[PDB]
Structure formats: C-alpha cells, structure tokens
Write a protein that binds this ligand. Structure first.
Ligand SMILES: Cc1cccc2ccc(N3CCC(C(=O)N[C@H]4CCC[C@H]4CCc4ccccc4C(=O)O)CC3)nc12
Ligand SMILES: Cc1cccc2ccc(N3CCC(C(=O)N[C@H]4CCC[C@H]4CCc4ccccc4C(=O)O)CC3)nc12
Ligand SMILES: Cc1cccc2ccc(N3CCC(C(=O)N[C@H]4CCC[C@H]4CCc4ccccc4C(=O)O)CC3)nc12
Ligand SMILES: CCCCCCCCO[C@@H]1O[C@H](CO)[C@@H](O)[C@H](O)[C@H]1O
Ligand SMILES: CCCCCCCCO[C@@H]1O[C@H](CO)[C@@H](O)[C@H](O)[C@H]1O
Ligand SMILES: CCCCCCCCO[C@@H]1O[C@H](CO)[C@@H](O)[C@H](O)[C@H]1O
Ligand SMILES: N[C@@H](CCC(=O)N[C@@H](CS)C(=O)NCC(=O)O)C(=O)O
Ligand SMILES: N[C@@H](CCC(=O)N[C@@H](CS)C(=O)NCC(=O)O)C(=O)O
Ligand SMILES: N[C@@H](CCC(=O)N[C@@H](CS)C(=O)NCC(=O)O)C(=O)O
Ligand SMILES: CCCCCCO[C@@H]1O[C@H](CO)[C@@H](O)[C@H](O)[C@H]1O
Ligand SMILES: CCCCCCO[C@@H]1O[C@H](CO)[C@@H](O)[C@H](O)[C@H]1O
Ligand SMILES: CCCCCCO[C@@H]1O[C@H](CO)[C@@H](O)[C@H](O)[C@H]1O
Lengths: 148, 148, 148
C-alpha cells in the first residue's frame, strides 16, 4: 500500500480524514439548526418548510457557519502542510504530536464554538492548533528553499 | 507520465480539474452579477462603477456567494479525499463511479442553486454528491488506521 | 529528499507555503482589527472584551473577512493545481513563472484589498494571478483526458 510511502503518512491520513468528517458533522448540524429554528437562506427552501417568512437569518445558524468558515480557514491549510510535511522525513513521534495537537485543538475548537463556551476557551484552542501548522510551514519553507 | 501512478488517477484529475473550473465559473458569474445589478462589496469599487450608493448587498450576489461557499465546503474536501483514495488501489470502475457521481452532483448543485430551482432539488444534489465523499473517507480511515 | 521528485516541485512548495503564511497573516490582522475596533462576532467574546455592545459588525473586520474569503476562493485551488502541475514535467522556468505570477499577484491582492487601494488595482491583481491557474488547469485537463 502507498499509505506506507513515509512513516508519518498513516497518522497524517487518519487525523486529516477525521477532521474532514468533523467538518461534515458541522454541515449536518447546520442543516438541523436551519430546520429546527426554521431559518433558511433561500426563498425556495422557506416555501417548502412553512412559508416565505422563514427565509431569515438566525444567530445559531450564523454561529454554525462561523465554525464551518473557521474550519475552512485552518483545516484546509493543514491538509496541504501535513501532507507535504509527512514526506520530509520527520521524526515519527514528533510528527504524531504535530497531527494530534491539531486534531485535538480543532475538535475542541468546534465544541467551544458550537457549545458557546466562555472566552477565551475557543481562542486558546484555535491558537494551540495553529502552533503545529506554523511549525510545519517553517520546516517546508527551509526544505523547499534549500532545494531551489 | 506520473498521471499513471495509479489506474484511478487520470479520472480523479479530470473530474477535479473540471470542478475547479466550475468554481472559477461561479467566481466570474458573481462578478457579472455585481456589475449588472450594480452591487459592490467595497466603496472603492462602487465609486468607479457609478457612485457610493452602489456599495450595497444584493440577493443574487448573495446567492452566488452561497453557491461558491458551498463549493468550498464540499469540493475542497473531495480534492483531498479523491487524491488519497486514488492511491488505495480501488476498483477502476468503482472509483470512476465515485468521481462521476461527485462531478454530476456538484454541477447539478450549482445549476439548482443559481437557477433557483424548487426545493428539494438542490438539497438532493448536495446529498447525492456527498455519498461518494463519505465512502472515500471511510475507506481512507480503515487504510490509515490499519497502517498505524 | 522527496522535494526533488520533480524539478518544479521546490518552487511550488516555496510559493505555496508563503501563500499559506500570507493567509495566516490575514487571520492575525483580522483578530487585531476585532480587538482594536472592539467588534466581535460572538457574545462570549464581547463580554470578555468590554461588554455585550461590542458584539457587532465593523466595516474593517468585514473587509478582512472578504480578503480571507477571496484567498480561500483562489489559493486553495492553486495548492491543488500547482501540485499536480509540478508532476506533469513542465519547463522549469515556465513553471517558476506560473508560481511567481500567482505569488506576486496574490500578495498584491491582499495589499490592495486591506490597503483600500483605488479600483481597479485589486481587480487587476486578481485577474493577473488567475491567469497561471487557468493555464495549469487546462494543462492538467489535457494530460488527464489523454490518459483515460
Ligand atoms: C456533509 C455530509 C456528509 C456525508 C453525507 C451527507 C448527506 C447529507 C448532507 N446534508 C447536509 C445538511 C442538509 C440539511 O439538513 N438541509 C436542510 C436545511 C435546509 C433544507 C433542508 C434539506 C432537507 C432535505 C434534504 C435532502 C433531501 C430532501 C430534503 C427535503 O426537503 O425533503 C441536507 C444534506 N450532508 C452530508
Ligand atoms: C475565476 C477566474 C479564472 C480564470 C481567469 C479569471 C479572470 C478574471 C476573473 N475575475 C473574476 C470576476 C471579476 C469581476 O467581474 N469583477 C467585477 C465586479 C466588481 C469589480 C469588477 C471588476 C472589473 C475589472 C476587472 C479586471 C480589470 C479591470 C476592471 C475594471 O474595473 O475596469 C473580475 C476578475 N476571474 C478569473
Ligand atoms: C493564523 C495563525 C498562525 C499561526 C499561529 C497563530 C496563533 C494565534 C492566532 N490567532 C488568530 C487571531 C486571534 C485573535 O487575535 N483573536 C482576538 C479577536 C477576538 C478574540 C481575541 C482573542 C484573544 C486571545 C487569544 C488567545 C488567547 C487568549 C486570548 C484572550 O482573550 O486573552 C487569536 C488567535 N493565529 C495564528
Ligand atoms: C464536531 C461537532 C461538535 C458539536 C459540539 C456541540 C456542543 C453542544 O453543547 C451544547 O451547547 C449549547 C449551546 O449551543 C448549550 O446550551 C449546552 O449546555 C451544551 O451541551
Ligand atoms: C456552472 C455554472 C452553472 C450556471 C447555471 C445558471 C442557471 C441559470 O438558470 C436561470 O436561472 C434564473 C434564475 O436565477 C431563471 O430565471 C432562468 O429561468 C434560468 O434559465
Ligand atoms: C499580507 C498582509 C498585507 C497587509 C497589507 C496592509 C496594507 C495597509 O495599508 C494601509 O491601509 C490603510 C487603509 O486600510 C491606509 O489608511 C494606509 O494609508 C495604508 O498604509
Ligand atoms: N476569520 C477569523 C480570523 C481570526 C481567527 O481565526 N480567530 C479565532 C480565534 S479568536 C476564531 O475562533 N475566530 C472565530 C471565527 O472565525 O468566527 C475571525 O473572524 O475571527
Ligand atoms: N453551510 C451549509 C451547510 C449544509 C449544506 O451544505 N446544505 C446544503 C443542502 S440544503 C446546501 O445546499 N446549502 C446551501 C448553502 O450552503 O448555502 C448551509 O448553510 O446550508
Ligand atoms: N467572491 C468574489 C467573486 C469574484 C472575485 O473574486 N472578484 C475579485 C476581483 S473584483 C475580488 O477581489 N473580489 C472581492 C471579494 O471577493 O471580496 C466576489 O464576490 O467578488
Ligand atoms: C507561532 C510560533 C510557532 C513556531 C513553531 C516552531 O517551529 C520550529 O521552527 C524551527 C526554526 O525554524 C525549526 O527548526 C523546527 O523544525 C520547527 O518545529
Ligand atoms: C452517508 C452514508 C454513506 C456510506 C458510504 C459507504 O461506504 C462504504 O463503507 C464500507 C464500510 O465502511 C466500505 O467497506 C466501503 O468500501 C465503502 O464504499
Ligand atoms: C483565462 C485565459 C488564460 C489561458 C491560459 C493559457 O494556457 C495555455 O493553454 C494552451 C492551450 O490549451 C496550452 O497548450 C498551454 O500549455 C497553456 O499554458
């Protein structure tokens, strides 16, 4: 299997795929909140689900969208950085720690966001998860620059 | 050519690249709607295109942005999942079906969204396209986990 | 090192990683603008940073989010297209030009956006940067299609 192309790759692929699934969970939750709060973005949706008055914004729907947007701002860069980093021959344990900190930090971020936990819990989880991303980015920079 | 690194890879790369182009089409349409409806997001844009009163929201512009956002929520994960999945040695025909269902579902989604088609047409196309994504995600999970 | 898998790959990885860092800069700027303008998206944030009246929109915060969103609309596709393109055996210099035009155009885009530069400066930088993306997309299309 090509999953064993580098020692760090299986761990990366596991964490990444779980994070993609975690984004899908946010999408599904968003839909549930739209239905339960009767807050649809489109008149065609509203007309099917009770009437035109239900084409409206809702604070919980907006919160769901913010969490999903923040995921796109952070998880997508990780999918790139972590993949490249997996092939730079990092220490297996060190690589695992990078991926695990990102995974745990991001899951915690969604819990803190959707759960409306007191500040600065969400902001701390965000910061924590970005640390391994910064680390991988710098490592890629050095490796790429030195091969020019 | 490195396109033949796995039997499924050419089909993946074709479908993916078409989907990226399809997102670019949404970006271009968005610009056209801004110009034709005179609805700009920035005062500097509005001042060039008729005056400060044209820095305003518009329902069709907002709809375009929703379609584009939904694309980012779904197509970007597919770019990751489909790439990895291509290297897991799936059945060539089965892989093609995964990619084709996503491609057709997503093109249909944009048509249903921008075309303001009756519900639940858009929601059904969304659901259809997510099915192969869920399938690939699970397959990657098993392969990654078993190589830990 | 696997960075030398293709002659164009180091240049791609350098430009890409710089662009990811450039997105991170936008995220950090956004946070700074929220703090300095006292404009928070969440009541829990506002209550920590002065009171509930600070859960409010702000034009500069919205501008930051637009720049970040536009980055997600363009840089993420480049991460995909440029990676694949690096393995299609393009002319080293031609590939560098594709990556450099995207890098320079996108950095200029953020400067023009956050700097509120007169139109059509931002729109021109956007257009310029999309040109190598269109070029790479077409090249991938031909290579993928011919290997079907
Ligand atoms: C993210 C994801 C991953 C994997 C599989 C997924 C499978 C589905 C999936 N959805 C994400 C939330 C969506 C959701 O709950 N939308 C609701 C809010 C506005 C409209 C309403 C749709 C109702 C509906 C849906 C489908 C068919 C008919 C109807 C109807 O109107 O009868 C549904 C699709 N995500 C998935
Ligand atoms: C997505 C994509 C892929 C490949 C190539 C692309 C090439 C271009 C491209 N655009 C996406 C829609 C944008 C658009 O229509 N914007 C208009 C709405 C607000 C401002 C206005 C801009 C007008 C303008 C543009 C360029 C130069 C001068 C002016 C002017 O003001 O004279 C233009 C760039 N996307 C592309
Ligand atoms: C993008 C990125 C890359 C690499 C490393 C990064 C490291 C951090 C990082 N931030 C992106 C801007 C965020 C920011 O400035 N947020 C402020 C606006 C609303 C709330 C406020 C948070 C204040 C805060 C933050 C952390 C801990 C405690 C508190 C507090 O309340 O005491 C902070 C996290 N991005 C990074
Ligand atoms: C990956 C998806 C994670 C979903 C985490 C949802 C956390 C829900 O948490 C809930 O939040 C409510 C406020 O929204 C509170 O009223 C409840 O006390 C709390 O249980
Ligand atoms: C990939 C890009 C797909 C673009 C699909 C655009 C579909 C346009 O479809 C149009 O939508 C209008 C409402 O918006 C209707 O008034 C028209 O009847 C319909 O033809
Ligand atoms: C990658 C991040 C690039 C940040 C570029 C920020 C450009 C700031 O530029 C500033 O913009 C202000 C308006 O916003 C103007 O008042 C100032 O004259 C100008 O210096
Ligand atoms: N787009 C972000 C940029 C900065 C950021 O990511 N901040 C973190 C920590 S405060 C966050 O959780 N932001 C909430 C959000 O993006 O909605 C924002 O508007 O806040
Ligand atoms: N961000 C989405 C999450 C759920 C989703 O993707 N729903 C599908 C099927 S209803 C959709 O087409 N949503 C419209 C949109 O994202 O604007 C939303 O707000 O609806
Ligand atoms: N989502 C974009 C689609 C078109 C686009 O990307 N336009 C360029 C050139 S005008 C841009 O800089 N848009 C500003 C933005 O996306 O906020 C929009 O709403 O304008
Ligand atoms: C936001 C600040 C986080 C910094 C992450 C540290 O990242 C570290 O940078 C070093 C020097 O470039 C590298 O040698 C090291 O491999 C890397 O883990
Ligand atoms: C949203 C529900 C869609 C489920 C997609 C099914 O996905 C399937 O899962 C099986 C069991 O894990 C795998 O053996 C199989 O390869 C995969 O195609
Ligand atoms: C938006 C218009 C930009 C077009 C980019 C041109 O792209 C070019 O297309 C040719 C024909 O397909 C290819 O032979 C060539 O390799 C490619 O650079």
């Amino acid at each position: 299997s090509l999953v064993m192309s580098s020692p760090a790759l299986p761990a990366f692929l596991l964490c990444s795929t779980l994070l993609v699934i975690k984004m899908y969970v946010v999408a599904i939750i968003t839909g549930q909140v739209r239905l339960r709060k009767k807050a649809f973005a489109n008149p065609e949706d509203a007309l099917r689900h009770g009437g035109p008055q239900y084409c409206r914004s809702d604070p919980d729907v907006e919160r769901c969208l913010r969490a999903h947007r923040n995921d796109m701002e952070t998880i997508y860069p990780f999918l790139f950085l972590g993949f490249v980093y997996s092939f730079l021959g990092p220490n297996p344990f060190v690589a695992w720690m990078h991926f695990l900190v990102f995974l745990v930090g991001r899951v915690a971020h969604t819990v803190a966001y959707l759960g409306k936990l007191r500040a600065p819990i969400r902001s701390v989880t965000y910061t924590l998860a970005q640390l391994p991303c910064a680390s991988m980015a710098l490592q890629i920079l050095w490796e790429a620059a030195r091969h020019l």
